[PDB]
Enzyme design. Sequence first.
Site, PDB file in Angstrom:
ATOM      1  N   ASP A  68       0.874  -1.182   0.000  1.00 27.68           N
ATOM      2  CA  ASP A  68       0.000   0.000   0.000  1.00 27.68           C
ATOM      3  C   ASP A  68       0.929   1.256   0.000  1.00 27.68           C
ATOM      4  OD1 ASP A  68      -1.843   2.015   1.744  1.00 27.68           O
ATOM      5  OD2 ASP A  68      -3.202   0.716   0.786  1.00 27.68           O
ATOM      6  N   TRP A  69       0.586   2.263   0.825  1.00 29.51           N
ATOM      7  CA  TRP A  69       1.431   3.481   1.020  1.00 29.51           C
ATOM      8  C   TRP A  69       2.815   3.186   1.579  1.00 29.51           C
ATOM      9  CZ3 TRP A  69       0.925   8.047  -1.197  1.00 29.51           C
ATOM     10  CH2 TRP A  69      -0.333   8.474  -1.606  1.00 29.51           C
TER      11      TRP A  69
ATOM     12  N   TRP B 244     -12.831   4.890  -4.541  1.00 30.64           N
ATOM     13  CA  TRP B 244     -12.202   4.809  -3.199  1.00 30.64           C
ATOM     14  C   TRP B 244     -12.022   6.202  -2.573  1.00 30.64           C
ATOM     15  CZ3 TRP B 244     -11.276   2.270   1.093  1.00 30.64           C
ATOM     16  CH2 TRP B 244     -10.212   2.615   1.915  1.00 30.64           C
TER      17      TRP B 244
ATOM     18  N   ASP C 233      -7.968  -8.092  -4.971  1.00 30.83           N
ATOM     19  CA  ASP C 233      -7.764  -6.635  -4.792  1.00 30.83           C
ATOM     20  C   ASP C 233      -8.185  -5.997  -6.092  1.00 30.83           C
ATOM     21  OD1 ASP C 233      -6.738  -4.045  -4.442  1.00 30.83           O
ATOM     22  OD2 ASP C 233      -4.771  -4.707  -3.671  1.00 30.83           O
TER      23      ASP C 233
ATOM     24  N   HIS D 269      -6.006  -7.238  -0.635  1.00 36.35           N
ATOM     25  CA  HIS D 269      -5.057  -6.129  -0.559  1.00 36.35           C
ATOM     26  C   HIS D 269      -4.042  -6.269   0.565  1.00 36.35           C
ATOM     27  CE1 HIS D 269      -3.743  -1.997  -1.106  1.00 36.35           C
ATOM     28  NE2 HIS D 269      -3.958  -1.772   0.175  1.00 36.35           N
TER      29      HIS D 269
END
Lengths: 299, 297, 299, 298
Positions: free
Chosen positions: D123-124, D163, D250, D279
Amino acid sequence: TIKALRTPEERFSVLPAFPYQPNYVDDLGGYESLRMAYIDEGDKDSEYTFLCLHGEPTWSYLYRKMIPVFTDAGHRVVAPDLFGFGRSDKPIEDSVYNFEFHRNSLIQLIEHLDLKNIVLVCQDWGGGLGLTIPMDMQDRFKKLIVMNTTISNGEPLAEAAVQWMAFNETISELPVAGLVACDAGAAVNVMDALAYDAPFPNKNYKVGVKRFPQMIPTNADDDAVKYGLRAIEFWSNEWSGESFMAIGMKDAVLGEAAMMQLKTVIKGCPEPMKIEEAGHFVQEYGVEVAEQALASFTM
Amino acid sequence: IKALRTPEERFSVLPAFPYQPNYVDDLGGYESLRMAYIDEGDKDSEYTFLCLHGEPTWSYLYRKMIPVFTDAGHRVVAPDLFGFGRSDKPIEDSVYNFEFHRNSLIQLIEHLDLKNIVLVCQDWGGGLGLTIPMDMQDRFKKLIVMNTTISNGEPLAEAAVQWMAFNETISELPVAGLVACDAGAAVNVMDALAYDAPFPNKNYKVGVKRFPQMIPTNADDDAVKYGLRAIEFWSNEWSGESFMAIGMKDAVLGEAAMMQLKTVIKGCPEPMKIEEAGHFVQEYGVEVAEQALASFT
Amino acid sequence: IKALRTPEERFSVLPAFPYQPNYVDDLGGYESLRMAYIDEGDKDSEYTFLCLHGEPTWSYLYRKMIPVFTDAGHRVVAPDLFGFGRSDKPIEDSVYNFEFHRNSLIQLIEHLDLKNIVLVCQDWGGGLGLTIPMDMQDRFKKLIVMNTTISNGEPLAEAAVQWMAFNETISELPVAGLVACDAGAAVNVMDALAYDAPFPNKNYKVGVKRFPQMIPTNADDDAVKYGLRAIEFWSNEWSGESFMAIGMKDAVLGEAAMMQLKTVIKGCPEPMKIEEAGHFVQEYGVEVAEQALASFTMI
Amino acid sequence: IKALRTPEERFSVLPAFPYQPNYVDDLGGYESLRMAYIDEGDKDSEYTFLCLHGEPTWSYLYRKMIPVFTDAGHRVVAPDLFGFGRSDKPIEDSVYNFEFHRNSLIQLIEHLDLKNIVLVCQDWGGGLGLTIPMDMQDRFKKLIVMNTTISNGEPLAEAAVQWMAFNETISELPVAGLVACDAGAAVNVMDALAYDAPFPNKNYKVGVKRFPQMIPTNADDDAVKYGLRAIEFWSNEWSGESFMAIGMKDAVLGEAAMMQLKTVIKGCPEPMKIEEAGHFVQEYGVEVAEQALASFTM
Ligand SMILES: [Cl-]
Ligand SMILES: [Cl-]
Ligand SMILES: [Cl-]
Ligand SMILES: [Cl-]
Ligand SMILES: [Cl-]
Ligand SMILES: [Cl-]
């Protein structure tokens, strides 16, 4: 005169989730006396015919959840069983099965029923074969519902595809119901497993099942790729119909990455429906696909 | 005894079950019928885990449990019943019955002279196996029990009757299909291959056909005669340690059946309830084997 | 009674539950505490499906069942218990108890003058609700029952004791987390938002905290006093139709507890056992509502 | 910097994450904002696995991976980003941005003087973390990458836009709800408790709110400036070993996005594709950590 087996009828006596009487054609030019089974439901004067093509190792039973959605909306559905599958006759010689053998059978069936205003519904080899047909019958096909599938372009095979081929080479025979149940999870029950194993009392009936993995092209000189590259041109430049794509995300071979690549060559293809709970066999999650396709389309 | 032997090539791809099988073909009464069995761990181990499969499985079903037991210093014996796995398969339906199976296991036990036995069972593994210790009390020390029952002659539940009628209406039972449908994500296509491996066609499935037919509908059935005496044994005579694991996604031998069973096993602690597991509890069996061992002395 | 009202903005994103709520704020004994309830279908419908939630849910839990009942021509009433959903939430521990909840439902029933009731319940919905018909026998005709229990005073099973201690060890119960863990693919993040919506913080969760504490540990508890009378009612007086659906993935109130319950409901047919459902059966509740209705003689 | 500290009682029930947290509150530029981090394994281990979480998680996400790495004789450092886990949580929207986060990680790295780093991200964690090695080349040796992306400025997919609009429209994101919905059977209620633990109420969730807002919509964004330079680094300058694991369930950063990413990582082998994983790949991460280690030469 092609040596083949017919699955004993008692194999099909318990099909509660697929209560259609099959139709048969046994005079297809080139296949004389080899009998192809197909579902044909809805009014013959329906505007549109949904032509639903299965692949490896399934049959029209795979479309049992989609068919009622289409017929409820006033359309006709044709869902053939490929030779080697379902209730169709099953050649016993390896070499009879090939890309041309299958493709031509579908072309002959289409011309035999004089299908028009076709919505092509395909997945797996259903698409590998089927997506190569409209380019040679452009006036027959109006729309497309596409699920986990690909058009052969001749590129080197990804590791997953190579592993799949080597698997099918090494084993005694493919566990057909096993494979589908492993893919679809809770969407398939034991009654469905019975239906998927029904065509195949033993391996003598599975020559077509054995041959499909062997037919995946490994070089650009295969018929699959020759037709494939022409089809890619057709969907990208000629095609002027409506399309809808549904992706089963739990597919390591023909999932999201392969489907998005495919979308780039289908002119006009809208945002795909991405089904997180669905595997390769998208049609086991196919009620909502059929509903959303119809809502998206101008019928 | 007229029987088929599954061709060896059927078993050439078994990456998750890399044990060399052992064979015995001179069990008393079964002369020349060859029984396959796994035997792993040191022969002089304190304890032997005797792992019994049922319908329509074989010792492959125990592949996740076996390494837990052997890693802890124990021996494991996991036979394939006649009609299943790599064992020979009688072709006449009348040969299969409760006595035929029970006695094969009794003979195997006496042939290997198994002692300090931890009985691990499920399905007919338990239906049969739970009736054995009462007639060989000194050989059995502990019990790991998963989705199973002991026959008591009570009316059959509707689910069991439906199961019997299913098996009588179909052409043949889809073996890999059934296990994959039950076990979900715990089973892959390599496992499906293994489950279909014993049975090139329905001629090899007479034992698979017979198990559902053997579910007792009469209190004079051997299953119930032995069954009622077993219930007495586990309730009053048994003095060993036990551990129960329940696959909750089972409409026939799930929580309700397992809790009833627990009431007749003296000393049985609180069951492990596995929400994600179906009838084939051993596909979720690593944690069952771990917790059993931790619970045990 | 000192209480908090959940800010309305909490409920602005509920696309799966598009009913305008009704309110009542003068229930006898609860003056000025406002109870929210869904009321859908024709008011003069033959039958009213009274759908009672438990811990830690609200009428949103019934969103999949409600349309099945209304599409069959019936009325549905689905209240939010005080402390839950859109109802007001007392802030003092002691205000919540078995009598407080039970009497609120009795008052609501009288207030709307509900008759020809099909009781739909689960969890404390049943623990409470199954004790109501014995004191209003003419109002209740049929029962749809899912993972629940009636208190009999017996020692608690280990799972229930563990549940009480876990609730009393934690800072607060993660509401959406618990439901999503139980219901799997049947709940998405929009649903998780709906389940967290009543509770901006733990000050709003005093009712949620109290339910586990209310599980009876002595036979003199009101839950058991009412409970034992209820058991007598369902086993000897009750003359209606029933239908039971069991979520099998429930380690506390699953198959074993539900089969015990079935033994005390006179006339209860073979239960529907849903292998994929957990404690929150109503997340798998379309098929429960369909099958209940088909099983019933709704005249 | 105005911030909240999650009350300690929130973390009293964490049986699946029994590591005592370490803290640093003098990172250059970050006033007395305290960052929490896990630090396990022998301090003199050859290799350090730097495990970076994203939205809306914390180091707890790495609980199944950490023991695999430490069992093999390595050190693990798993920080909680500011706004997450046990770290302090700024209450002002504008404090959170790409630079704020990236620099915090750079400062932590220099503070612990981390050296033979195996970057583990998702992710981030990746969005930020993948942009760091280009400015500290000598400290990074290998990469384990899970469902993530490097910002390239290209149009957002519809799912990403949806999102962002979701996070705008809602009162606050249900943190445990989201993770449980994604990971299914891999998460239980004890895990849900851990994921909600940082956030007694929305005042604590400003960083959670800000991450979706930070997704770049076009090429004019710090994420993309850094991003395009990182893509150059992984494609041309990177010489290390890599391993990719993709959670297939995902809809945003699954197979399609991960295969695109693989094309810009020189030397990246065939990805491990986990059909059951969403995810939050690390909830299925035991086998990822095992296979990464087996694939690697150390
Ligand atoms: Cl034939
Ligand atoms: Cl046939
Ligand atoms: Cl294939
Ligand atoms: Cl059986
Ligand atoms: Cl409760
Ligand atoms: Cl985000």
